[PDB]
Write a protein that binds this ligand. Structure first.
Ligand SMILES: CNC(=O)[C@@H](C1CCCCC1)n1c(-c2cn(Cc3ccccc3)nc2-c2ccccc2)nc2cc(Cl)c(C(=O)O)cc21
Lengths: 57, 57
């Protein structure tokens, strides 16, 4: 009777929330990849800086 | 009656997947915060290393 209606409305609301949750997940994964690249770059800029310091010792 | 239980079961399975999705999102946010702190730590170390280079010029 009415239980089909609330259930379909609940499934629509949950499905909508699941779609935006997966979009957030994709964005967080992309942001995590960007920070790993930026971290990797900063560490290697310090490997270069360190090696150059060691030679002028 | 058959449709009602099918809708009860797909909303329950979808809700379970949404809870699992939010837990993934929390883990990606924690990892993103970790990499951002490690990047900041490398940029700060870079400043002090650059100072050391400037003194041996
Ligand atoms: C065929 N059904 C599905 O694919 C289900 C999922 C399959 C079984 C495990 C979890 C659900 N689904 C649905 C979905 C499909 N109803 C059936 C339905 C019935 C009437 C109206 C609207 C939806 N229910 C849901 C639902 C319900 C509650 C919370 C989250 C999702 N929306 C999705 C959005 C997304 Cl973003 C995704 C995804 O990318 O994986 C999947 C979703």
């Amino acid at each position: 009777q009415e239980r089909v209606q609330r259930l379909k409305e609940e499934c629509e609301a949950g499905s909508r929330e699941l779609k935006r949750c997966k979009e957030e997940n994709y964005d967080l994964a992309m942001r995590l990849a960007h920070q790993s690249e930026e971290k990797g770059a900063a560490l290697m800029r310090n490997r270069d800086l360190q090696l150059e310091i060691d030679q002028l010792k």
